[PDB]
Amino acid sequence: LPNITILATGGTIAGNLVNAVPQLKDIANVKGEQVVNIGSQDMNDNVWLTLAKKINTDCDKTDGFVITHGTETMEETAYFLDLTVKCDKPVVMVGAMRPSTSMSADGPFNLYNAVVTAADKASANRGVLVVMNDTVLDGRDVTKTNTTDVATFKSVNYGPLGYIHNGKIDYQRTPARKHTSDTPFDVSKLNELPKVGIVYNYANASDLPAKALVDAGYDGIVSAGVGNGNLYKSVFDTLATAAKTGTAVVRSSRVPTGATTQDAEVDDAKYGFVASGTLNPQKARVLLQLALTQTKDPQQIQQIFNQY
Amino acid sequence: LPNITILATGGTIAGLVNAVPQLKDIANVKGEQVVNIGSQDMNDNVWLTLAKKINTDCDKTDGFVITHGTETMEETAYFLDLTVKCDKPVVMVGAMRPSTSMSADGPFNLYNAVVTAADKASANRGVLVVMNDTVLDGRDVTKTNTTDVATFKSVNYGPLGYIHNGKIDYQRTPARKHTSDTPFDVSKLNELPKVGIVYNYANASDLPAKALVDAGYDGIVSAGVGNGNLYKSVFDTLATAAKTGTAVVRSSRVPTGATTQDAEVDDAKYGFVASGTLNPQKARVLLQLALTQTKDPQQIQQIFNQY
Amino acid sequence: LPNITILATGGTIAGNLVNAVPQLKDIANVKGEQVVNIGSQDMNDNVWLTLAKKINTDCDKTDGFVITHGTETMEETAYFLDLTVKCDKPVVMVGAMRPSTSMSADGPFNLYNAVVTAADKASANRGVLVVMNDTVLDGRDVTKTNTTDVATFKSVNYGPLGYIHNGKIDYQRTPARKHTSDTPFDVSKLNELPKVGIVYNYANASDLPAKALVDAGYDGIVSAGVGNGNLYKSVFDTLATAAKTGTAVVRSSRVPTGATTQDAEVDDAKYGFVASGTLNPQKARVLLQLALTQTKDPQQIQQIFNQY
Amino acid sequence: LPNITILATGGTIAGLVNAVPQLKDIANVKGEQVVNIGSQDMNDNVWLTLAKKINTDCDKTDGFVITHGTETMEETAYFLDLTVKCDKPVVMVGAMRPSTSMSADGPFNLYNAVVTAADKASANRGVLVVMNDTVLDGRDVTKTNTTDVATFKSVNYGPLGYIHNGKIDYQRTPARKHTSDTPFDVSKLNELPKVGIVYNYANASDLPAKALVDAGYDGIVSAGVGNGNLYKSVFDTLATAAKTGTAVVRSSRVPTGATTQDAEVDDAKYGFVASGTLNPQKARVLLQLALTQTKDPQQIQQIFNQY
Lengths: 308, 307, 308, 307
Hints:
Rossmann fold
């Protein structure tokens, strides 16, 4: 059987796991390590870095990775890994929307399908994956869609990669944007990422949140804008100013699906802004950080946002 | 024919009676420009004058159609939903495509909005939003896609009705209390309490929050992660704010579902309020209105459970 | 505690139930009877009738009803009950998309939420309900949306009535079309319903399926049409003929959401057809049957389709 | 500019080069009326002439746009998806609103269809359907709502791309084999095997099924309940049909999800084939094509697993 490493980041989503869900040993030789233990609402740069470094380091001593993670920021960590992992093997993330002690807990079957997915030769080369509710989803498009439903995770713009039925996966899609080993981002020698904060836009929005970050010298700000990436009067003036003094700004949107498009609502080229495409604000933050270890040029950051 | 007043807040979404002549077959239309701005610039002032206007001219017309940008449409709708005291239908409409583009959506949207406003059956269902052949309630409606003509949906509870050929099949009506059943009256107000929103994500900074607490904001709404949870730093900052008078609502960046009470965070211990299904921008509207009435978290929660 | 009767129609969706899901006895006094035992793909007129007659007969000796049922035809039985039950008390239907022995089986929590719903004073007067995946759905709009997902049941046109969190229900909607005790349909003295069959429309469709039913003297045919209730050349000619000789025909659609509207695509008044509104074909069959015990007039059957 | 041929199958969805002049900014357009019918009347003949035409004129143009009714659009798309042998893009488009209604959708749909057909990037993605700013693959696309302009979606796997300002962001491409990678060639055919569809519901009659078996149909597709299950009577009838040569595919009336193999029904024991995610109308298309190749259920299943 294939050797699969389980990397745990928080509490257990089932019930070692192998004793709590004994069916696991019919599809794989499982072994687990606790790399950290926190609720995902506390996820941060440190954890990301040690996760990536680990996966890259232990890549050759296993056939696949399953990463146990809270649902709250799952979509964030998934995209980060999608851009920094250099392992050929499958890296699959999984979680549970119900506590492992509640009746009809979802963790056990999710964990099982995650291992099934990691052990499938066909899962290789599709980038970092998230398996939930019988579905294989790519790290880039997947997002949390409902606060409590077991079926909350969906790839809202472009759809899932596959569905699992009885331990078999029917793959009918694979991501087109470049990921993992095709990206130029390498964090193996990094101890911190650039600082990137997110501001929200709504009626009568205050410019203070933005000004606080510009004053603390943040490397980039991501704007959760209204509609197709638009911004409130005040927030606009503040960010426009930031940009011409070296702060990098990405226009994203609080609207949950669709792309924030280039030069449509805002003259990006005139102000030096970057449009995030379909990346929502939290995902746009992950990319902007990674771009910033590479360049400060908005014209180039845009190219990056068009390729990954 | 019914008299319908069109209140314009921005540019024209069509081309009105001359641009879409079919209008005078269902109503006697008249329009005024109350303000002219893009909705991404919508603000407290505008809201107040809109409400005062509707309440004041309520008796000289049978229904209102409000032309508005889609960007903050869902915000204004909820505000009106809570402050209008007119029995008559108040309908909001917009367009996702410029009126000059081919296949522009404004004309038929405007048409169906007037149809909706002139329908006797539309009365008493609170402020409505009509887009893409659908009648949606001001509370649940939200922008779902950045560019799709079909972007507006009532994501948690669904639409009130569908329009086909100028007839509306109503199969639902809002249960939360709205318009004339709320205790909020802004007719004598010139400003609303100050309420800001902060976002949560991995490694989130506490600075945005601290900026608002330092400027003495009356309330902060937190766009949390998952079921209204917060990042370490933002938590500590908001928890402190709350015990010094600042009101804090836990909402969520997750587009559908309720942020529930005392599940993820001990709301009672810290004095927080959970927003239910109100997304952050909508939660800001209600917190503002609540704050003109009370500063008690235990009561603000009650308000969040009723409206 | 409230007394709740569980009426079982097939296999058990959990594991008496009270021993398999012991939490039940904290919210209700439960008692169960097996009225029949079949897979729901075999549901039929007989079963419907005995279900309705039972609920109506035992109405006064309990506070609420939970009906255990297969998912396959759930939406059919739910609507039938929605139109024939005369009990004031709550009638809630529930099922499971996963076998009760599979890991992460959904039956137990569904059953629990169904009992919670039935015992809630607020559930009364909202018509027959279906509780699945933490959601309260009305019998009329609810349909099966996916072949295997635990979250398959949704009220696709008008939305759910409420969501359950921790045994509390937040109701924010109630159905407007008349149901249960406001309908004129009474089956308490019936031993059979009129015969109503369904035909499908697609490219190059054959007229044989329709002609078979007209020749066997069916009381009504429901057409699963294409688009907004349209029909294929051949099927059209055959049904148009049927209608002017006394067969009642409803135009519905195979498209899963939206209304099949009146006189839009087909001149209903000229041919004597009835449009189903938002009722999908299987649901339109249930109503047509019930209307037929009352009238053969198409003009009137249409009124019925506009009221229930 | 690229030369694009528009093949019309019904009425005009716009008003073409004169009705939507912007067209001549992106392509040299030319059109022919190959047939003229409402798509609810689409049939085998039309399909065959469409395919033969595209294959025959493939070299005298850079791309095809096919104008077609929305009712059976999803059926024709899949058929072409399996029988076209042209490298060039073949795009289908329609309109949910009559070209004379205000806010008619045909013009911009047509525009984006031509844009799509002229894009070098659209090549090799199989037959496409362009509606409401979206590029969808012929296999997964289906009609989702009876009247909404946004009705077409690829409900199981999602769209291939979104169009904004005449640029397409492609992020997906179909994995199942299509067009020139399939073994189906109808260039020498004058008729397809006969395949009918039956529906399942409570108390379903077996007559519809029996009518087709008695008329010697080559195959029957069953729109089953749930995961492809069948009613008592329909089951017994189809099971019998299968062991006498009739081919039977279990599909489902449930609009999304796969009907899976050997889960609910023992397909191997009765000789049935499960359709996977193909809905009944789409399952009919593939069964027809398979039947021109084989009558073996074990092999028809393989076909259903590959295309």
